[PDB]
């Protein structure tokens, strides 16, 4: 019906500023250290 010259345009529904736009194509119209290895009792203990 609406198809024009081999083009299948059929599958279409047919029934501030106020600009006007064209329809169908819109455009303007833990762990804490332990004592060892912490450097005491490694220089100490006079007993």
């Amino acid at each position: 019906x609406x198809x024009x010259x081999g083009r299948x345009x059929x599958x279409x529904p047919x029934x501030x500023x106020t600009x006007x736009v064209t329809x169908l194509x819109x455009x303007x119209x833990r762990x804490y250290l332990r004592f060892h290895x912490x450097x005491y009792x490694x220089x100490x203990x006079x007993x």
Binding site: F35, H36, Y40, X41, X42, X44, X45, X46, X47
Partner: protein
Amino acid sequence: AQQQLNKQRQDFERVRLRPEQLSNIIHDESDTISFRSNLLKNF
């Protein structure tokens, strides 16, 4: 055997750093100062 050195250090320091108490700790003045008696005397 680094744990044995640590146990020895603990035994030594528990004796060295132990605080005296209710004994020869005897205090000077400015410690045994009664504020109440001075206030009464001045009154």
